[PDB]
């Protein structure tokens, strides 16, 4: 019914596909939104009780923000600034706790398996650290030996990646179009051969070669946009793409809405 899509292969963390009947600008704008303007959740203010670890109070505080948390029910949660509470709360904040003591004489490793949510869940899949380790203890924090202590109270708040890269649930967007380069948007630098020196792309298989002899297309326009989207875990790989379209028309819905207002 207009712009068409075909999934090449789809995994638990990655989705490869093709895009037909699409504008190049809208294609590049799609990745831009998926990168930054995607609403997530992560730590914003790490409160400290005791720290004896060889890492600076702020080294740790930084680390945490980067630890992924389940953001499946992101929209239900409200932005802290948009909230009515005197700073923080359940409807906008997910309090966590990281209590630790190097009892084991060994190199006492700390992971996501060590942090506990101390706020009300509100019966929603949100604020859960993402574990992707075989032994079931994802994302390493720090290490302690003997009398070394660390007790925290890290607090999660909404936010998009345009504020800080930690709310970036797009691990990297693989973007490609016209691998045969019929449209001729790039001038291939070569000392001997153009084709031999320049690597042939995976996306050549899914497109028609130039066959040669025929003069370059005068009425040229870009199409067939090959894309692989990688999630970090904060949100499922399917939601990543769809929410990217959702927020984009939302960021546009705002413009006309305002146009009417004026």
């Amino acid at each position: 019914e207009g712009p068409q899509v075909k999934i090449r292969e789809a995994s638990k963390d990655n989705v490869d596909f093709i895009l037909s009947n699409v504008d190049l600008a809208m294609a590049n704008s799609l990745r831009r939104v998926m990168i930054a303007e995607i609403p997530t959740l992560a730590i914003d203010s790490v409160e400290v009780e005791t720290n004896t670890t060889v890492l600076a109070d702020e080294f740790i505080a930084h680390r945490l923000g980067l630890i992924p948390l389940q953001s499946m029910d992101i929209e239900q949660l409200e932005y802290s600034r948009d909230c009515f509470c005197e700073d923080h709360c359940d409807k906008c904040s997910v309090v966590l706790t990281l209590q630790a003591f190097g009892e084991s004489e060994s190199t006492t490793n700390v992971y996501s398996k060590d942090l506990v949510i101390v706020s009300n869940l509100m019966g929603r899949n949100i604020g859960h650290p993402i574990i992707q380790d075989k032994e079931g203890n994802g994302v390493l924090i720090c290490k302690l030996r003997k009398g070394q202590e660390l007790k925290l109270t890290c607090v999660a708040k909404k936010g998009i990646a345009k504020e800080h890269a930690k709310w970036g649930p797009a691990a990297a967007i693989e973007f490609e179009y016209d691998p045969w380069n019929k449209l001729k948007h790039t001038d291939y630098w070569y000392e001997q051969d153009s084709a031999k020196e320049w690597p042939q792309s995976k996306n050549c298989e899914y497109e028609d070669p130039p066959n040669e002899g025929d003069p370059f297309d005068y009425k040229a326009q870009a199409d067939t946009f090959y894309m692989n989207v990688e999630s970090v875990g904060s949100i499922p790989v399917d939601q990543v793409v769809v929410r990217g379209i959702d927020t984009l028309q939302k960021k546009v819905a705002s413009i006309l809405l305002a146009l009417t207002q004026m």
């Binding site: 190049l24 590049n28 990168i35 930054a36 990646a161 990297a172 967007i173 790039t186 792309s201």
Partner: protein, 196 residues
């Protein structure tokens, strides 16, 4: 700075979106300029960009080294077999529009290093403050709130410019300044201070 003597300074920061990307979706950790290398003649840099990419892709820590029988043609062969373009150049897309960039940016993980010279500890601005104990002119050093010394040659400029009145006030109230009473007969600091 790179391990070559290419003393770089930041002059704006963009995040992932605006920044250009390879087909794999790789944005550079920073952007240099093609204008450094010919005036500096920094060749070892271009191979340090190169050799580091192969060293990262192969996993086996690639030997940079000084006097070793290793050539770029030897490096390129191992990079060509690694799938990537042997010359180093990668087809990049404009982070803004998506439209392919006519020129293919040299992409490689050159070992960079942060320097102990930061702007926040370099900056200063004084609009009247503590004056020298003997000379009554602004003090020295940003710390003790010390004013910028308008050098001998700076004066030479306000003279050449024909700014007889700029430097007339710049040497006075706009900096040092002074009011005295002298004898008409002797022309010395000899009149007894009373006024009232």
């Amino acid at each position: 700075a790179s391990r070559h003597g290419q003393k770089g300074t930041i002059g704006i920061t963009y995040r992932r979106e605006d920044m250009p990307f390879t087909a794999e979706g790789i944005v550079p950790d920073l952007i240099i300029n093609p204008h450094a290398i010919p005036s500096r003649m920094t060749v070892a840099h271009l191979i340090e960009c190169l050799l580091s990419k192969v060293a990262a892709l192969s996993g086996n820590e690639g030997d940079a080294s000084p006097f070793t029988d290793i050539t770029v043609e030897g490096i390129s062969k191992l990079l060509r077999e690694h799938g990537y373009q042997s010359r180093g150049f990668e087809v990049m897309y404009n982070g803004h529009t998506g439209k392919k960039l006519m020129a293919q940016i040299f992409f490689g993980p050159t070992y960079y290093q942060r320097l102990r010279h930061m702007v926040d500890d370099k900056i200063h601005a004084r609009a009247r403050g503590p004056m020298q104990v003997l000379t009554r002119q602004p003090v020295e050093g940003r710390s003790r709130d010390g004013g910028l010394r308008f050098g001998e040659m700076e004066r030479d400029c306000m003279i050449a410019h024909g700014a007889a009145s700029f430097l007339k006030e710049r040497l006075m109230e706009a900096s040092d300044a002074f009011r005295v009473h002298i004898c008409g007969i002797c022309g010395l600091m000899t009149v007894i201070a009373k006024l009232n």
